[PDB]
Design a protein around this ligand. Structure first.
Ligand SMILES: Nc1ncnc2c1ncn2[C@@H]1O[C@H](COP(=O)(O)OP(=O)(O)OP(=O)(O)O)[C@@H](O)[C@H]1O
Ligand SMILES: Nc1ncnc2c1ncn2[C@@H]1O[C@H](COP(=O)(O)OP(=O)(O)OP(=O)(O)O)[C@@H](O)[C@H]1O
Ligand SMILES: Nc1ncnc2c1ncn2[C@@H]1O[C@H](COP(=O)(O)OP(=O)(O)OP(=O)(O)O)[C@@H](O)[C@H]1O
Ligand SMILES: Nc1ncnc2c1ncn2[C@@H]1O[C@H](COP(=O)(O)OP(=O)(O)OP(=O)(O)O)[C@@H](O)[C@H]1O
Ligand SMILES: [Mg+2]
Ligand SMILES: [Mg+2]
Ligand SMILES: [Mg+2]
Ligand SMILES: [Mg+2]
Lengths: 261, 260
């Protein structure tokens, strides 16, 4: 099981770096650390000796990238993790998505270099990656935190099924029980969803419990997540004005989130 | 890994039944066998009527019970942990619902409606592979052990899913994988091939590559032996002349593993 950590070396990415290393160690899984030299920054001179200016900027960005990679590589080696570092140039989300094809789990921070420590939202690189990634994406808040619990938003939709299947191995390897949350006005429908997810988890060596609720799903999922709880759910598709369930959950999440498509 | 075998008890489903049991045994994986009482058949009388429908459902349900008992007996004999499930509704619908709790589906290419000379795909198999959330393995009627594996890889999203789905299977079976990447640009195809080979090796699977040009479907079809598991992404659109996967799946000579 290959873990791919994407980091821009920013404070907001520190939690992701720590979590990826912690997971690699706990799961005895190899870790690939990726830093992308942002062409959107290097191209600024062009949007305005432009080739020279662009080269000078790329050189600075690449050197910063090498420093970040070396720092994480050093940390990972110290932890006893089999780590490899990759430095590429391009649009961050595109490069990350390309490298994701060879990974089994991605770990990114909620935000990065562009936002201060007061930002509770999601950066655009993280947003674009989770919406198009072929493999599960784990978004970690800036402040490092261990995964001490797990909950799953399950409505039996295709993506919820993928989230369910993606979560099982992680919960199993970490010894975490999973709280299945199924929300619907029809209690019989929600119950059927919950029992299904619980059966799957138990069949895969994971303890599970369920909460069959009515009302607003996003609100319930957000309120039930503790700072160390991994909240797993299907990734959003449409970009709704008021936001779909997953959009509202991911934007306001207090703890680590695992998305799957 | 939970394997879900869907069978209608027909001769065309015998291959899938055998393969599912064989895989469960080889991987020490639990097996669920599902038979669906087809409401499309039971409801024919609706075209009193309720009594006639009930009499047909009763017959269909009893056949299903017999099929499940036969398969369960075989599996239990091999030491496989098997669960039997009797459902009623539209086959592909019930199969797709049950798939949400499985990690791999095993179905025959065709079933009860076609003779032993049909090399095509039945509508239940078609609908299931196109909408399944988990990998679907389509097995020919004649039972055959998987003795090899090939992967059609063009780095597309579904090809990536197929690649990730195949790895655990090839590993457990000790089969090497021949990666086939096709494109007019040799460099692009090689990059694709190398990417898949690297993933497979990183997951304990030996791999080789065939970088080709020309028609992808033709190459994939021609390279598949009767015992080779051909893994590829499931089709999306229903093209008039058929997309690559549509053509491969329709004419495949051996077992196919689809993912999406
Ligand atoms: N250049 C990069 N290289 C590698 N990973 C990156 C890069 N940029 C962002 N990431 C990953 O995406 C996560 C979110 O960063 P993101 O760029 O989306 O937020 P932001 O930088 O604060 O706002 P924005 O980039 O939209 O202006 C980071 O914590 C990191 O894991
Ligand atoms: N009622 C619910 N109960 C529990 N979890 C839910 C519920 N609704 C949504 N979710 C979670 O959120 C994920 C995505 O739901 P969401 O409706 O936001 O995406 P979508 O429906 O697939 O795309 P779209 O917003 O375009 O319809 C689901 O896969 C599931 O994990
Ligand atoms: N009633 C059923 N219950 C369980 N599995 C089924 C059922 N019907 C079909 N299947 C699965 O689907 C595979 C393909 O059968 P399919 O129904 O698609 O071909 P067919 O019956 O010959 O043609 P058609 O059903 O379109 O008239 C079967 O081998 C079996 O694995
Ligand atoms: N050039 C190729 N080389 C190797 N394998 C291929 C190639 N093209 C397609 N495939 C295989 O066939 C699968 C599906 O390809 P296909 O083009 O038929 O589906 P699609 O492109 O995703 O949907 P659509 O036909 O609507 O565009 C891929 O995931 C891949 O495994
Ligand atoms: Mg950024
Ligand atoms: Mg929805
Ligand atoms: Mg049929
Ligand atoms: Mg295609």
């Amino acid at each position: 099981m290959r873990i791919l950590l994407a980091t821009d070396g920013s404070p907001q990415a520190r939690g992701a770096e720590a979590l990826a290393e912690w997971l690699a160690y706990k799961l005895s899984a190899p870790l690939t650390v990726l830093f992308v030299v942002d062409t959107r920054l290097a191209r600024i001179p062009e949007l305005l000796p432009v080739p020279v200016l662009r080269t000078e900027l790329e050189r600075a960005l690449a050197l910063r990238g090498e420093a970040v990679l070396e720092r994480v590589r050093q940390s990972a080696l110290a932890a006893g993790v089999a780590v490899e570092a990759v430095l590429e140039e391009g649009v961050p989300h595109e490069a990350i998505l390309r490298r994701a094809r060879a990974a089994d789990l991605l770990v990114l921070g909620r935000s990065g270099e562009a936002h201060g420590d007061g930002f509770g939202g999601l950066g655009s690189t993280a947003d674009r990656v989770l919406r198009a990634s072929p493999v599960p994406v784990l978004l970690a808040p800036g402040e490092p935190v261990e995964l001490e619990g797990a909950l799953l938003g399950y409505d039996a939709s295709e993506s919820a099924v993928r989230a369910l299947h993606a979560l099982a191995p992680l919960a199993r390897a970490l010894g975490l029980g999973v709280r299945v949350v199924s929300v619907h006005e029809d209690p019989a429908r929600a119950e059927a969803w919950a029992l299904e997810a619980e059966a799957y988890l138990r069949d895969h060596g994971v303890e599970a419990s369920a909460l069959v609720l009515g009302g607003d799903a996003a609100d319930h999922l957000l309120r039930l997540q503790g700072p160390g709880d991994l909240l797993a759910l299907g990734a959003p598709v449409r970009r709704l004005v008021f936001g779909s369930t997953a959009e509202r959950v991911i934007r306001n999440a207090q703890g680590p989130v695992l998305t799957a498509r």
